[PDB]
Design a protein around this nucleic acid. Structure first.
Length: 1666
RNA sequence: UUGGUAGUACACUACU
RNA sequence: AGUAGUGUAC
RNA sequence: GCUACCAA
């Protein structure tokens, strides 16, 4: 270029300060380069350099004899032109590395010139002459133009333009307004996250391993790809395109070579058939018998259920004290001489009060009356046992184990041999199970089931009326009469009474066991006057034996836990074995009636074939399995049966390798059979499932699995997949799990260490990647995915808060576990000594019924650590100034370099699976690094159409549906196109003589096109443990949105992460060190150097959970190559194919649809499955062919189905959780937790009737928790003005009355909404009745408040004075702040207590910044102070101690008669010690006698609940204005998304508190928010209302009340926080009977769908629904 | 904080 | 006894 | 572990 021009540009660059000025430089730098090229080009072409000539000048140059006024010359201005030989060459110069500019220019110029061409007969050639400024190659489109100038030599250099453009861009590299302007249309960046890179990367051994293993050109291409800078390059994609083109040859060879395997394919793909199943079963038994200790003996059986049962005796009392006597005389009078009969007679004698009945009752009543006076426990007053006849009584139903009444070796017999207390080569023996495969052992199971059938299927003598039927039977019946009739059929049987009795007795056993002692036994009862339980001494878990009285002998339910039936005074007495269960398993039994009723009705649903008696017999044993045996069968059932009916599967290898029956239980022997039978039965009806849409019309052609009968496909899948959900959580033992996990991780590591060397390959070696195919696919995908969003790096920054402070991020301030490494020898040794002393104390005290320091010495290379809470580890790092309040990403970038050594540990999930899963726990700073990598991926997965782990909400279910609609349409129309010539030839030929000439009709109709659908439902194996981590190095390196600095640090981290060490936890080390015998081939010893170290180096296993987004993206890539191969292979058969593939971490749902005429379909299947496996292996995944299975109608994907187009789900899994899913806080709060399960089940397609049943079971379990059932102690019915429990409010443990449409949408808050809708529809005049909701509420002033019934007035008082500011009855517990020693931030809070006035300073800080009472705030100081303040809360401190739901459950029962309600906190919301539940009912009613409601109070209720909520106005409008069409049957359901009904809080509340909207942090729009906010303040008077509230308090108290000011400011600013916060719209997908488009559609569909099982109703509205 | 002493509190109670 | 287990536990 | 009391 020109010299003096360069000096001017170089000056403009130095003097520029704005980005607007810098942009103008860039514009002219580019135009200068364009001009420079043309001036040089024209010299080579030997033509006049014309600057920019209008088109009219061109015509006037070459054809003077033509009029400007007549011809309409196209309005363009070409850079040059050339007229020779009656041809006009219009010329345009370009300087781009791409010809996208050139093709726009060509098309514009070509299109316009056609019209003017015909009016002059001059042909026009549009010539674009491009030069690629980097290479310097020319590119010319016109074939005539190159025939004129065949040798163009523009010798030219652009280096001075790159030098200049560089200087400009280095100068404005951080100016984000520059990056915006400079940005092309298609791509935009933001400033670097760091200035320097990381040179220590390039020296790192793992990179050198990585590098050295690649071939040389790829090495250069990696280093080059790291160093790329999309902002400083000509175009963003050059490095990606450069690398795509280099790999293209090797890639398209691999695709073509792989596609031609279609012709090699035999067609003998792995199928299921009778032989495979028997061979699988026989190989399986061979394994199981080598692995277990088999037993053909029925006395080796363990309890199938931990209970024995007998019917009640209605000739006897059901009084507590009669029952106690009845048992005491029965035990003392046991006739005969058995091995334990002396012990039981003694126990009976030890509980013997004789005639002294009233003396017992009044003694017990007095002790109880003492405990219930106090909120806390009664301390320092000793419990003394009263002598009442032979019984020494410590408490109601607690009796001293008296030494006089039992020979002291019969006492030892009871404890040691019967209860196991203190009970006791080279090898350790195998686990013992029953021989499930032995036919005599099977018949014993078959017997037990037929024996249990006989007793339990008989009618109990009782009225079938219980809580569920009484309160909800009305609405269950209305939705479906059949399910009401079924409930009756269940409640009549002994089944239902047995399990109710086992539930109620267990509830009581737990209540009783709490305060049982080492020197006492206790007695539990139930409503059945013949069933009891003796709770033995714990010896520290719950020990017990069940006792049944009965008239005749063998007439008791014995599911394998009877010790013996004995003859006694009156009839017979049967006593169970001694059972020992942890409290978690016991809770499950309490909840079992809900499970049973739910299970029975669900299996029986809408099916006239099945017999209810047989269902109950199966369901009772499933509902009461609290033991591992059944876990071994329920989930494998899925794979065995589904593999058995698949088109392609591997039933042999699944059963052979994986299926491991664990039959300790006769019921599990019976069930293992039902599974086997079902595998064969599945094969036998394989053609009844697969095609030869019609899945919508569901007929009963399949054989039932678990009980005899006939079943539809939907009902058949529900039978296969539901059983898994009978599995309880927490059945595992930490002791055993920790070892199994530790050793499988180390086995995978040791295997890799010894055998797995090569990283790359070309023949699918185990644990390798095809390097060039990886590189090429990644390039194509990154190009594609980046292209479809231009601000991607910006999207990543905003959505994941990269720019904001670390303290504003929800995951970086959580209560999750978090590892930290350091020296903690003193803290851990002084824990050891404290638990030594306190164990020795309670050991020495227990003699009533008569180490860490070492570990460290044994481990020279130990690595100390301690787990803590994430927010606490953040506090710590901020305090020691390792972290700052700088933008999170900048600090993540520093951490990647700063944190060299990585450390992880694990704990056990306690999962419902047969083998328990591991959960990994890393350091805080490891979570910081992975955040960046994962959140980058996450946003790019959202752009990828295949990738679904990133799909928000329930979108998956709607995506499955849209694919199968698309695929069905493709199959049909594509088969119609390929046939129509043949179909017209045959159908026109078969008009004249359809019968005759049938040799010619089938001449052509064999050669017509064959349809083929196949659905691969795939699982992958060892997803995290056996990946090739090295492949992700390319994913980072190729990434155009990363700068080379960031890439360098990210890759350095990823190198360090492959050196990460796993810490075997101290719990596991103790267990292992305590082993007397050495373990044989001890993998844990091998990998620790004889337990010298507590760490093992883990390399290839990126730890499960950590890289799910990036791994899933690469899995999405493997499927793009699979699509490409299949597309080629089918074009070799001139066929048609559609391939879809959905990917979610290690789950896959690929869907092939093919039409071709050249080949047998079986060979195409054998091809597609082989190439599926290979596609996976070429990218480092391993498809698990024991679990993957192919159908042509059924897509399973992340436990969501699609059956012939129609979506389907096991809604039953959500219904089973409705029973035992709760935190145990209060009646409202617990019920709400349980109701949401029914809402989730509803949106997965639960029928209205079964949803009502579920809702009843929730109400039952909730009221049971706080002793609030009908007739019970805390039952509110008699304390309130109401004739039903649906008339009392839901907040005071009422019963929920609303339409199920309403409950689906708004939950418990529907209880009040509907009540207010009932009032409007009674107390507004008939003229106004036809109006919408806004007008009916406006008519509230003209209401006869006199006419309002008592009840309605009562409810409105609660809505006014209680509901509108916080779910009000809440038991408050007295418990301690257990185990906060670990928390760094807790000891700082403790120091702030010890400081003089230290807290008072902090409280006053938080009143001056009331923003922090309901946010965390952007500042560092603001985070740390708000943390220390939270420790002031009791509820927050109990959150950090590990929760225990069975204790939380049982404590909540026991304190239901104590005074646990703080009525001052309830009352002080209307003022101008503690109290019991029932007293709180009296005190609340009398407060309502001191209040009245005017017509303004009612208006205020309707305003807050209805009018100030768009959704509530809508839901109200729909119910009032709706009119229903006639009923109709559901014909195929459709997924529809629930629409949004609605229309910076941390800053806005700071801006509200101090009236400036001008804070160091983020304009006019945050001054607008304050004006919009102050509307809400002046309406409700809150600022000027709480001032009266505080001043009144401190005037009465006499001095300034600092804590009350905090509490009132909190509830003031918490009301402000719940206005200045948008409902971030979650995606909720609902299965409905038609498709929703509008918002009104969803409401009408919902309203019409959820009222009967039989049918659905269309719903319309008479006015608008907004 | 350690060392000592003496305690460590409650549901179901039902047409059966 | 019960719970757990081809890891010595409760 | 909690509670009351005592002793450094």
């Amino acid at each position: 270029m020109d010299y003096q021009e360069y000096q001017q540009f170089l000056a403009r660059i130095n003097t520029a300060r704005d980005a607007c000025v810098a942009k103008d430089i860039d514009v002219d730098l580019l135009m200068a380069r364009h001009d420079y090229f043309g001036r040089e080009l024209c010299k080579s072409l030997n033509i006049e350099y014309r600057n920019d000539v209008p088109f009219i000048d061109i015509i006037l140059d070459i054809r003077p004899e033509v009029d400007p006024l007549t011809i309409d010359a196209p309005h363009i201005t070409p850079d040059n032109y050339l007229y020779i030989n009656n041809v006009l060459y219009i010329i345009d110069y370009k300087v781009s590395v791409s010809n996208e500019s050139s093709v726009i220019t060509y098309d514009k110029y070509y299109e316009l010139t056609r019209d003017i061409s015909d009016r002059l007969s001059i042909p026009i050639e549009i010539v674009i002459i491009r030069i690629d400024p980097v290479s310097r190659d020319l590119h010319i489109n016109s074939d005539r133009f190159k025939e004129l100038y065949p040798t163009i030599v523009v010798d030219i250099n652009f280096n001075q333009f790159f030098d200049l453009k560089q200087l400009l861009y280095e100068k404005f590299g951080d100016d984000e307004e520059f990056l915006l302007k400079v940005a092309h249309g298609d791509f935009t960046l933001t400033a670097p996250w760091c200035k320097t890179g990381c040179p220590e990367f390039w020296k790192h051994p793992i990179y050198k391993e990585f590098k050295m293993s690649m071939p040389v050109p790829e090495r250069r291409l990696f280093e080059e790809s790291v160093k790329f800078n999309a902002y400083e390059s000509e175009r963003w994609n050059t490095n990606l395109v450069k690398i795509r083109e280099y790999t293209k040859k090797d890639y398209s060879e691999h695709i073509s070579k792989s596609a031609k395997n279609i012709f090699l394919a035999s067609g003998f793909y792995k199928q299921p058939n009778k032989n495979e199943i028997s061979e699988g079963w026989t190989l399986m038994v061979e394994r199981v018998q080598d692995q277990r200790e088999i037993s053909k003996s029925l006395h080796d059986q363990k309890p199938s259920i931990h209970f024995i049962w007998g019917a009640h005796n209605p000739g006897n009392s059901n009084n507590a004290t009669f029952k106690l006597i009845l048992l005491s005389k029965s035990l003392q009078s046991i006739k005969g001489i058995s091995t334990y009969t002396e012990a039981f007679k003694s126990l009976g004698k030890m509980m013997d009060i004789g005639d002294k009945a009233i003396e017992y009752e009044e003694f017990c009543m007095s002790l109880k009356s003492k405990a219930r006076s106090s909120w806390k426990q009664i301390m320092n007053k000793k419990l003394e046992p009263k002598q009442i006849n032979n019984a020494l009584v410590l408490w109601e139903q607690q009796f001293m184990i008296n030494n006089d009444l039992i020979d002291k070796s019969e006492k030892l017999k009871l404890f040691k041999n019967f209860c196991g207390i203190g009970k006791h080569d080279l090898e350790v023996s195998k686990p013992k199970i029953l021989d499930f495969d032995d036919a005599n052992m099977y018949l014993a199971s078959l017997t037990m089931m037929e024996q249990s059938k006989k007793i339990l299927s008989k009618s109990n003598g009782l009225k079938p009326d219980n809580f569920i039927l009484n309160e909800f039977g009305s609405r269950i019946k209305d939705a479906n009469k059949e399910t009401y009739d079924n409930m009756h059929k269940i409640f009549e049987t002994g089944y239902w009474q047995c399990i109710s009795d086992f539930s109620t007795l267990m509830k009581n056993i737990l209540s009783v066991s709490q305060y049982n002692r080492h020197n006492t036994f206790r007695i539990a009862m139930c409503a059945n006057n013949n069933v009891f339980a003796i709770v033995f001494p714990s010896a520290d878990t719950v020990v017990y034996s069940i006792i049944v009285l009965h008239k005749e002998e063998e007439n008791i339910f014995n599911p394998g836990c009877l010790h013996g039936t004995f003859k006694c005074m009156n009839g017979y007495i049967s006593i169970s074995r001694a059972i020992r269960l942890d409290k978690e398993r016991c809770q499950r039994i309490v909840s079992s009636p809900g499970l049973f009723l739910t299970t029975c009705l669900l299996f029986k649903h809408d099916n006239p074939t099945l017999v209810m008696s047989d269902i109950m017999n199966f369901s009772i044993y499933t509902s009461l399995s609290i033991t591992k045996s059944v876990l071994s069968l329920t989930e494998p059932a899925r794979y065995m049966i589904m593999n058995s009916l698949a088109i392609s599967s591997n039933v042999k290898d699944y059963i052979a390798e994986k299926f491991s029956p664990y039959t300790k239980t006769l019921f599990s022997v019976y069930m293992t059979r039902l599974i086997k039978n079902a595998c064969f039965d599945a094969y036998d009806q394989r053609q009844r499932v697969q095609l030869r849409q019609k899945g919508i019309k569901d007929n009963r052609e399949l054989t039932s699995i678990w009980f005899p009968g006939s079943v539809t496909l939907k009902e058949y899948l529900t039978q296969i997949y539901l059983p898994f959900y009978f599995n309880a959580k927490g059945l595992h033992e930490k002791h055993h799990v920790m070892v199994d996990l530790a050793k499988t991780i180390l086995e995978i590591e040791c295997e890799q260490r010894e055998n797995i060397k090569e990283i790359w390959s070309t023949n699918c070696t185990k644990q390798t990647v095809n390097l060039k195919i990886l590189i090429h696919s990644l390039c194509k995908n990154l190009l594609a995915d980046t292209s479809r969003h231009n601000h991607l790096r910006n999207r990543i920054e905003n959505r994941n808060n990269f720019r904001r402070s670390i303290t504003t991020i929800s995951t970086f301030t959580s209560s999750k576990s978090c590892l930290k490494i350091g020296d903690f020898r003193k803290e851990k040794e002084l824990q050891s000594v404290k638990q030594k002393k306190i164990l020795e104390v309670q050991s020495r005290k227990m003699r009533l019924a008569n180490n860490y320091e070492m570990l460290r010495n044994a481990m020279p290379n130990y690595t100390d650590y301690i787990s803590t809470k994430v927010f606490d580890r953040l506090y710590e790092l901020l305090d020691k100034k390792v972290l700052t309040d700088k933008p999170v990403i900048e600090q993540i970038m520093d951490m990647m370099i700063d944190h060299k050594k990585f450390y992880f540990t694990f704990f056990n999930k306690g999962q419902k699976t047969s083998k328990d899963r591991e959960i990994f726990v890393g350091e805080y700073e490891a979570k910081m690094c992975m955040y960046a990598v994962e959140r980058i991926a996450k946003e790019r997965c959202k752009l990828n159409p295949d990738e679904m782990i990133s799909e928000p909400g329930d979108g998956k279910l709607k995506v499955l549906e849209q694919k199968s609609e698309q695929e069905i349409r493709f199959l049909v129309e594509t088969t119609r196109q390929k046939n129509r010539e043949i179909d017209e030839a045959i159908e026109a030929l078969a008009t004249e003589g359809y019968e005759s000439n049938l040799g010619k009709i089938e001449k052509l109709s064999l050669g017509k096109a064959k349809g083929l659908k196949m659905e691969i439902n795939a699982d992958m194996s060892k997803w995290s443990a056996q990946d090739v981590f090295y492949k992700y190095f390319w994913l980072i390196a190729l990434d155009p949105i990363l700068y080379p600095q960031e890439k360098e640090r990210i890759l350095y981290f990823m190198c360090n992460y492959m050196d990460k060490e796993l810490i075997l936890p101290d719990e596991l080390l103790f267990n292992l060190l305590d082993q007397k015998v050495a373990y044989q081939n001890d993998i844990i010893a091998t990998m620790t150097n004889q337990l010298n170290s507590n760490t093992v180096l883990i390399k290839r296993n990126w730890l499960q959970g950590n890289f799910n987004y990036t791994s899933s993206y690469v899995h999405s890539c493997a499927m793009s190559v699979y699509k490409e191969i299949l597309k080629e292979a089918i074009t070799l058969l001139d066929g048609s194919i559609l391939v879809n593939s959905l990917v979610h971490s290690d789950d896959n749902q690929t869907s092939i649809t093919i039409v071709q005429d050249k080949m047998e379909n079986d060979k195409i299947i054998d091809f597609a499955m082989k190439e599926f496996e290979r596609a996976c292996l070429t990218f480092g995944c391993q498809a698990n062919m024991k679990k993957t299975y192919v159908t042509n109608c059924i897509k399973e994907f992340v436990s969501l189905f699609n059956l012939y187009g129609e979506p389907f789900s096991i809604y039953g899994r959500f219904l089973l959780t409705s029973v035992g899913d709760c935190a145990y806080i209060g009646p409202y709060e617990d019920l709400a937790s349980r109701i949401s399960s029914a809402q989730t089940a509803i949106k997965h397609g639960c029928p209205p009737s079964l949803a009502w049943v579920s809702i009843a079971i929730s109400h039952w379990m909730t009221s049971l928790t706080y002793n609030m059932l009908p007739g019970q102690s805390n039952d509110p019915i008699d304390y309130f003005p109401a004739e039903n429990r649906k008339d009392i409010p839901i907040e005071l443990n009422g019963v929920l009355d609303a339409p199920l449409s309403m409950i689906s949408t708004v939950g418990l808050e529907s209880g009040n909404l509907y009540f207010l809708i009932k009032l409007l529809s009674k107390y507004t005049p008939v003229m106004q009745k036809r109006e919408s909701v806004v007008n009916q509420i406006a008519e509230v002033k003209n209401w006869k408040v006199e006419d309002l019934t008592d009840n309605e007035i009562f409810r409105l008082k609660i809505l006014r004075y209680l509901v509108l500011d916080a779910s009000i009855l809440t038991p408050r517990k007295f418990t301690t702040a257990g185990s906060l020693r670990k928390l760094y931030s807790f000891s700082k809070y403790q120091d702030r207590l010890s400081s003089p006035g230290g807290m008072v300073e902090l409280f006053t800080y938080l009143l001056e910044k009331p923003e922090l009472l309901v946010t965390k705030g952007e500042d560092m100081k603001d985070y740390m102070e708000s943390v220390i303040f939270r420790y002031n809360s009791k509820r927050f401190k109990e959150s950090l101690s590990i929760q225990n739901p069975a204790q939380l459950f049982i404590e909540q029962i026991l304190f239901s008669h104590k005074p646990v309600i703080d009525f001052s906190g309830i009352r002080d919301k209307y003022i101008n010690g503690k109290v019991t539940f029932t007293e709180a009912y009296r005190l609340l009613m009398r407060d309502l006698s001191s209040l009245e409601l005017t017509n303004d109070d009612i208006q205020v209720i309707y305003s807050y609940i209805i009018l100030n909520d768009p959704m509530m106005i809508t839901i109200a409008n729909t119910h009032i204005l709706s009119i229903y069409g006639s009923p109709q049957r559901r014909m195929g359901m459709s997924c529809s998304t629930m629409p949004e009904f609605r229309n910076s809080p941390a800053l806005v509340l700071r801006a509200y508190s101090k009236n400036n909207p001008d804070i160091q942090g983020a304009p006019t729009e945050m001054a607008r928010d304050l004006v919009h906010l102050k509307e809400f303040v002046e309406n409700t008077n809150l600022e000027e209302k709480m001032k009266v509230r505080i001043a009144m308090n401190e005037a009465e108290k006499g001095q300034r009340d600092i804590v009350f000011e905090l509490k009132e400011m909190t509830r003031f600013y918490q009301v402000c926080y719940e206005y200045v916060k948008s409902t971030e719209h979650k995606i909720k997908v609902f299965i409905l009977p038609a498709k929703s488009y509008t918002t009104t559609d969803f409401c009408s569909l919902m309203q019409g769908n959820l009222i009967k099982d039989k049918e659905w109703y269309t719903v319309h509205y008479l006015k608008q629904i907004l």
